[PDB]
């Protein structure tokens, strides 16, 4: 294809082994998941810019901006934790295993 | 189950959208509307594994037409054979492709 | 270097920023130099409440055994160079307080002190002559032709 | 290029003026002037602990604000299209969903604030 | 009495007067006692490489009217 | 319009013409030789025309637009 | 030559920063029924000079316990954003004529606050946490009213040029069809340049300085310069917007004049603000603009949506 | 070296991606996934997306400026690391970047890698048109038309979005 | 209602502005007379090119000229 969509494919399989092995911190992991669409939404703009596809100009902003609309999610579903836990790392997340 | 109702009650939500070669607004033609309606109308109604197995060829050349690679593989081989040609010395360049050369208009 | 000397004494001496370290009746006195009556702000004299950034310090009214520690730690946060005003009585030598359990004897056991304003509280007038003449000792500085015959 | 150009050139005049400001006067440092500031005594513990904030929903509900915003925000340009009537029907309709979920935040006690 | 700041903002006028002029003045000079061509669009860009193809100086201030054609 | 279709024709041209001089000695190659299955024109991508030019005009003319303020 | 331009753009500005220093002192002082500083030098001309040679040659003093990283990033970054926003501003011809330049602006001035967080976090204190937070606050405050403002007066430009924006003004000002737009527009700049009664982060009485408590003298005055130059360009910005000159191609003289003396007067008139009213809770900043603010601007963005439908008024967009 | 311009903005854009990937601190990633957007819009504005460009840049400072609130909030250890207070944050922090050189040197020597799909080195300016669009911009009548044609997407879109704040209202409630 | 409207009056004006303004923005257009107005207006601005057609010689609208009578005018907005 090209070099500049081997380069963000390959960001974003980097931010991919970034968020599926762990570091013992749950919002580092949900920076991980946003870089991931970072990567996503770069590359779909490219590829509809190169392509000039101009009605499909609507698809990478709202998959950005449903993006946000998960994410801000994992934020309240971060001080929940917090609201148990003193702090969020994953491996005191361990109580569901009996 | 893919329960289509956008024919069920006429109704069209994203049909609009979903094909390179749809309706666009102020009809501005994509960089591959005439191989997008080839291969439509080439492949429409009978059936995918016939598509497939018949409708090669416009399928190859949209495919081409939206990738551009093989393209890219005969700029890359003119133009390495242009540095061995100039780094070895027997090539000098025009001046019409050094910039002094007083375009058309 | 004599004329690089004449400049930086220029810039320090014409915007001297104080901090806001007042304890007692002087404090009030302070207060009423910076009224529109005396200006300090004409002099290039403006309050900043951070040690940060200022430059002097005038430490008005009594220092306590309770207050000794916060006005060192007060003094060593402030960023070079740095002078101490000490004024009214009760930073001088005690004054009133002089014989008491729980008033350091002057405020020059615990900070080198630059400038002696004598009052009880001296009057803003009195005060404007101090800093002037602290002015007047920063503007004589001789810090790079010291440097120089070094 | 002439963006790259004036982007240059500010973080040079930016970055020149701290290192004027740091290797041209004279240091001289001990361990008092590099000390926390509390106000003239020691710090109480260290400031890396968790604050107690209170407008954790504020900052989230900002965030969907904002991509509310990023939905009204290519209006102008409709402003040139031919289909006037949906339009007009649908922006209204978006800024009705903002001002529902304003109004849903002002009714069950989310614009106020915890404890 | 009041008026005595009237001299010192009158400097800030300066301070807000020598930057745009100064731009105006620069487009004066690079763009041949013309203002310079805004581009916003393709169309525009288009006509500017135009006037840059067919002036033959490579610049596209160098305008050529009526008289270039015989 | 008929400005940039003759420009169009002659930067081809051009290019078509000076691809015979170059490429003799490599064996197995037809100049000129199109990648699609189909003779209709199509609109060609930038590497075609100044693909042997100098890189000046590249980035006055590829990025020349975005780049002009 | 555009080293030149972007030099003589950029260096004029810190010069108006300092003797708006300068006549910020001497108002300050005169509406306090005092004399300003006059003694430096004629009516206090030299005030300026002294300030800026005194703090660059103190001592920048580092504290042991900050991170140097972005303790040495924040005020390089908060120079730089209120430097690279100069640009889009037609004066009568812009430095960099961007068709999308309010987005621009929007995006640096959001990235504006990020040297305050860095400031804030990078020092380890609990007044610049705490200035940090109120700086966060005033951010969840400001920006999901401003980005409707500016949207709002937007529509009846046609495009988000700023260039076209002095063409519409050529009949009538802005500020006679959106003069509740021009009070909501106001109180956002006095909201986001950090300015009182809206300070909320350099605060005096609350804090002692808030996120640039721990910064001494050197890596201060960026701040310092940042905030001014913010307040100087916000003014300029609000000029463009609401009240435009008359533009001749033949003379930029006229505009020139026109809009420097009206960005002049409006900063006269915001240190005539900033020291008039007392400082606002930050609990009661999100507790006016989530609740008086965005109501109010929710249905003059929905009446500019459908009013030029109304009246049958859709501007070009070119 | 000029012309390669959108593969220098892209391999920072690597880069800054290796070093976020790290997962050293929520603000120390939050400021190389910035860096990272930071020339992804870069590219984007140099491949004429002025709209998506700014809007990214706009969307990510206002969302982690969120994520530095909540960072500073509650997700937050005693002691911070930057980059070398941790071994493994460093170890996978130059194990990175010294892939993305592996393949920077494998793309700039035989211009064709195969990585999954083929991939060629020249900059993707060869494939950007010729032709002239006139008076306008394609995009902008992309996102004016999602009002017009985008009847569905808006109106999910939009429900989504309140959706999302009556679950984020609902979830923290406690009782 | 005159009480209730009175009460929420005196107590937030905001948020009766507020409603009084959505209102209008709401039932005004649908009692505007120039909206179609502003549908020829945005219908008639010339963004592409208006390509000719082929002739089978049947045709009585189209004209072969700018200038001739036949086809559409824009004498409503040069008046308005
Ligand atoms: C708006 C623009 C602002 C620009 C910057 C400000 C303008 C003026 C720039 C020069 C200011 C003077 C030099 C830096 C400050 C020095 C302060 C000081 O007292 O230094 C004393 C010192 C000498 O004192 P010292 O070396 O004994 O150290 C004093 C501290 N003790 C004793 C505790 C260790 O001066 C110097 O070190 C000399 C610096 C260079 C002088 C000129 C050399 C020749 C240049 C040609
Ligand atoms: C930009 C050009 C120049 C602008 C002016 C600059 C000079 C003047 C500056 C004055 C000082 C500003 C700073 C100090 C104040 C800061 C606080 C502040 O602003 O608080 C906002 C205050 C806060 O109100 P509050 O503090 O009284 O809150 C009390 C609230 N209740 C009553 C519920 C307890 O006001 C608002 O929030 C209202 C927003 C602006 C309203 C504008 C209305 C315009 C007209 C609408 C239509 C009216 C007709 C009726 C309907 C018709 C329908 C068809
Ligand atoms: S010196 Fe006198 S006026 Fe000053 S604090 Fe002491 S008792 Fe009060």
Not at chain 1, 51 to 68: D, G, Q, R
Not at chain 7, 7 to 32: H, N, S
Request: hydrophobic residues 50%.
């Amino acid at each position: 294809m090209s070099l500049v969509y081997m380069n963000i494919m390959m960001a974003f399989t980097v931010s991919l082994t970034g968020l599926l092995m762990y570091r013992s911190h749950l919002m580092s992991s949900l920076l991980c998941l946003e870089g991931m669409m970072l990567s996503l939404f770069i590359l779909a703009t490219l590829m509809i810019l190169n392509s000039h596809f101009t009605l499909a100009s609507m698809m990478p902003i709202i998959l950005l901006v449903f993006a946000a609309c998960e994410a801000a999610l994992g934020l309240s579903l971060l001080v929940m934790v917090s609201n148990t836990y003193g702090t969020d790392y994953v491996q005191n997340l361990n109580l569901l295993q009996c | 189950p893919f329960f289509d109702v956008q024919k069920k009650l006429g109704v069209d939500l994203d049909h609009w959208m979903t094909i390179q070669s749809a309706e666009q607004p102020h009809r501005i033609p994509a960089r591959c509307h005439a191989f997008e309606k080839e291969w439509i109308e080439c492949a429409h109604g009978i059936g995918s594994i016939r598509a497939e197995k018949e409708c090669k060829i416009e399928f190859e050349d949209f495919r081409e037409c939206l990738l551009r690679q093989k393209t890219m593989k005969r700029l890359n081989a003119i133009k390495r054979q242009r540095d061995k040609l100039i780094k070895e010395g027997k090539y000098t360049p025009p001046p019409h492709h050094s910039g002094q050369e007083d375009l058309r208009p | 270097v004599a004329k690089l000397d004449d400049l930086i004494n220029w810039a320090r001496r014409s915007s001297l920023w104080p901090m806001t370290f007042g304890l007692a009746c002087c404090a009030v006195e302070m207060m009423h130099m910076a009224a529109p009556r005396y200006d300090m702000d004409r002099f290039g004299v403006v309050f900043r409440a951070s040690p940060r950034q200022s430059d002097v310090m005038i430490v008005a009214g009594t220092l306590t055994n309770k207050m000794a520690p916060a006005l060192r730690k007060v003094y060593d946060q402030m960023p070079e160079p740095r002078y101490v005003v000490s004024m009214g009585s009760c930073a001088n030598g005690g004054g009133y307080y002089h014989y008491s359990y729980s008033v350091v004897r002057g405020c020059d056991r615990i900070v080198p002190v630059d400038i002696y304003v004598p009052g009880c509280p001296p009057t803003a007038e009195a005060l404007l002559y101090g800093i002037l003449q602290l002015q007047k000792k920063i503007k004589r500085e001789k810090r790079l032709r010291i440097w120089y015959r070094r | 290029m002439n963006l790259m150009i004036t982007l240059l050139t500010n973080f040079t005049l930016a970055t020149l003026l701290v290192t004027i400001a740091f290797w041209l006067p004279q240091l001289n440092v001990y361990s008092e002037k590099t000390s926390p500031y509390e106000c003239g005594f020691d710090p109480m513990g260290s400031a890396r602990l968790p604050f107690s904030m209170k407008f954790f929903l504020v900052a989230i509900t900002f965030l969907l604000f904002d991509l509310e915003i990023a939905l009204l925000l290519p209006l102008p340009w409709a402003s040139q299209t031919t289909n006037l009537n949906t339009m007009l029907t649908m922006a209204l309709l978006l800024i009705f969903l903002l001002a529902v979920s304003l109004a849903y935040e002002w009714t069950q006690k989310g614009l106020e604030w915890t404890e | 009495m009041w008026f005595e700041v009237l001299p010192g903002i009158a400097v800030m006028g300066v301070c807000l007067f020598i930057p745009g002029m100064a731009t105006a003045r620069i487009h004066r000079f690079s763009n041949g006692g013309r203002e310079k061509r805004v581009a916003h669009y393709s169309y525009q860009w288009y006509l500017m490489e135009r006037d840059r193809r067919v002036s033959g100086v490579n610049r596209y201030y160098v305008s050529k009217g009526l008289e270039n054609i015989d | 319009q008929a400005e940039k279709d003759r420009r169009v024709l002659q930067m081809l041209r051009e290019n078509l013409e000076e691809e015979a001089t170059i490429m003799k000695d490599v064996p197995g190659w037809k100049v000129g030789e199109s990648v699609f299955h189909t003779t209709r024109w199509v609109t060609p991508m930038m590497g075609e025309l100044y693909g042997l030019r100098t890189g000046e005009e590249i980035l006055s003319s590829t990025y020349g637009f975005i780049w002009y303020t | 030559m555009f080293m030149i331009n972007v030099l003589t753009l950029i260096i004029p500005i810190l010069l108006a920063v300092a003797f708006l220093t300068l006549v910020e002192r001497k108002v300050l002082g005169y509406m306090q029924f005092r004399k300003g500083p006059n003694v430096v030098g004629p009516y206090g001309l030299l005030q300026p000079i002294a300030d800026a040679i005194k703090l660059f040659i103190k001592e920048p003093l580092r504290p042991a316990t900050s991170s140097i990283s972005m303790f040495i990033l924040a005020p390089i970054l908060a120079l730089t954003l209120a430097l690279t926003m100069w640009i889009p501003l037609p004066m009568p011809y812009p430095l960099i004529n961007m068709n999308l330049g309010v987005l621009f602006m929007l995006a640096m001035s959001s990235l504006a606050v990020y040297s305050i967080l860095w400031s804030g976090w990078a020092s380890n204190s609990k007044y610049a946490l705490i200035g940090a937070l109120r700086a966060v606050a005033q951010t969840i405050s400001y920006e999901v009213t401003l980005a409707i403002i500016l949207l709002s007066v937007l529509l009846m430009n046609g495009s988000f040029t700023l260039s076209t924006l002095i063409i519409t003004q050529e009949q009538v000002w802005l500020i006679f069809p959106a003069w509740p737009l021009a009070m909501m527009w106001f109180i956002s700049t006095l909201a986001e340049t950090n300015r009182a009664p809206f300070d909320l982060t350099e605060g005096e009485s609350e804090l002692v300085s808030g996120f640039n408590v721990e910064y001494a003298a050197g890596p201060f005055a960026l701040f310092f310069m940042a905030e001014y130059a913010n307040i100087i360009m916000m003014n300029i910005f609000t000029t463009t917007l609401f009240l435009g000159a008359f533009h001749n191609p033949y003379m930029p003289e006229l505009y020139t004049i026109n809009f420097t003396i009206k960005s002049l007067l409006l900063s006269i008139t915001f240190l005539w603000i900033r020291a008039s009213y007392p400082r606002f809770r930050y609990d009661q900043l999100m507790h006016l603009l989530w609740k008086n603010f965005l109501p109010l601007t929710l249905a003059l963005c929905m009446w500019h949506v459908s009013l030029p439908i109304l009246l049958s008024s859709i501007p070009p967009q070119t | 070296m000029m012309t390669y311009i959108v593969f220098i903005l892209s391999i920072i854009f690597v880069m800054g991606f290796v070093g976020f990937s790290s997962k050293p601190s929520p603000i120390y990633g939050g400021l190389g996934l910035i860096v990272s957007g930071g020339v992804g819009c870069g590219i984007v504005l140099n491949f004429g997306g002025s709209f998506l460009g700014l809007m990214v840049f706009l969307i990510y400072l206002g969302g982690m400026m969120v994520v530095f609130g909540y960072t500073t909030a509650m997700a937050t250890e005693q002691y911070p690391e930057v980059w070398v207070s941790n071994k493994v944050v460093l170890g996978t922090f130059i194990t990175g970047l010294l892939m993305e050189f592996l393949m920077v040197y494998y793309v700039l020597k035989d211009k064709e890698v195969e990585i999954v799909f083929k991939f060629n080195g020249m900059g993707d300016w060869v494939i950007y048109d010729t032709g002239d669009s006139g008076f306008f911009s394609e995009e902008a009548m992309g996102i004016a038309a999602l009002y017009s044609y985008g009847t569905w997407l808006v109106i999910v879109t939009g429900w989504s979005l309140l959706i999302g704040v009556v679950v984020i209202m609902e979830i923290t409630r406690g009782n | 209602v005159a009480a209730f409207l009175k009460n929420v009056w005196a107590k937030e004006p905001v948020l009766v502005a507020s409603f009084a303004i959505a209102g209008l923005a709401v039932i005004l257009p649908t009692l505007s007379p120039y909206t179609k107005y502003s549908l020829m207006i945005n219908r008639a601005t010339p963004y592409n090119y208006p390509v000719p057609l082929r002739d089978d010689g049947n045709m009585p609208d189209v004209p072969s000229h700018p200038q001739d009578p036949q086809g559409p005018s824009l004498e409503w907005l040069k008046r308005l």
